[PDB]
Design a protein around this nucleic acid. Structure first.
Ligand code: K
Ligand code: K
Ligand code: MG
Ligand code: MG
Ligand code: MG
Ligand code: MG
Ligand code: MG
Ligand code: MG
Ligand code: MG
Ligand code: NA
Length: 186
RNA sequence: UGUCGAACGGCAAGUGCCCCGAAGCCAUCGCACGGUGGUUCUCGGCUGAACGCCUCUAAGCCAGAAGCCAAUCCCAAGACCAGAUGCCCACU
């Protein structure tokens, strides 16, 4: 067992990170995020004067140590979520039947996927903003916006997995909704 | 057919026999009704290290089968209900 293993992260000026009982609260501009990490059993420290976040595993083998970088990635993702945000742009790809997508409030409706009469409905949580790009700029583009990377990516994946092609050769029937670009709001 | 003399009324033939026949029982041979949510499988994914890259997995999440569990349905306190009540009596 390695006696001490640690990971370090620089904290920007406009964000504050608070740690208490393995519960991380990252609060910059544009909002605040909270991550429950009570399942990890690590030692989390924040030096506010030096703007550093440190996670330490004491007497760890490979399995406990591998969670150090995972915690660092999660805290980093929260930081860029509260500073710049997350924006996912997904595209509707079709061969013959156009994919008609309607976005009203927090509800997405997909019709005419491969000519099916069934309507595919999805309810986006209020923490993720959904919008449709005007067709003149980009054709068949849905944009998901939020501060939580996991919430934003889950919403895009949920939409993508709704329009799966069944009982067909997927190498030839490439119709679906795929996320094209992943960027930041600011 | 026999029989009380005939007619009437019947009666015998272990319901004489034939037709129709209510009530009741009864036929997918007739008619009525047969519903709601979760936990997971397999699998597909998200985030993501180990291993600066990568990766559904290692810690975390999402979606998810006629399986499984509960609701609904049937019996139901030896499941000993200090559940709620109506009248007496007992205690007071
Ligand atoms: K006879
Ligand atoms: K008859
Ligand atoms: Mg076929
Ligand atoms: Mg007779
Ligand atoms: Mg005689
Ligand atoms: Mg019957
Ligand atoms: Mg999986
Ligand atoms: Mg099931
Ligand atoms: Mg009872
Ligand atoms: Na990945």
């Amino acid at each position: 067992v390695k006696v001490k293993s640690l990971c370090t992260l620089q904290i920007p000026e406009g964000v504050t990170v608070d740690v208490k009982g393995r519960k991380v609260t990252v609060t910059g501009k544009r909002g605040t995020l909270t991550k429950d990490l009570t399942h990890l059993q690590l030692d989390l420290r924040v030096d506010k004067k030096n703007r550093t976040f440190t996670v330490i595993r004491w007497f760890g083998s490979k399995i406990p140590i591998a969670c150090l970088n995972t915690t660092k990635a999660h805290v980093q993702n929260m930081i860029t979520g509260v500073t710049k945000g997350y924006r996912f742009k997904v595209r509707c790809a079709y061969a013959h039947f156009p994919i008609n997508v309607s976005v009203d409030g927090q509800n997405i409706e997909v019709r005419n996927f491969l000519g099916e009469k069934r309507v595919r409905r999805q309810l986006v949580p209020n923490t993720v903003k959904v919008s449709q790009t005007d067709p003149s700029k980009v054709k068949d583009e849905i944009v998901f916006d939020g501060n939580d990377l996991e919430q934003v990516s889950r919403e895009a994946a949920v939409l993508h997995q709704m329009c799966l092609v069944k009982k067909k050769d997927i190498r030839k029937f490439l119709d679906g909704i795929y996320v094209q670009t992943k960027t930041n709001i600011e």
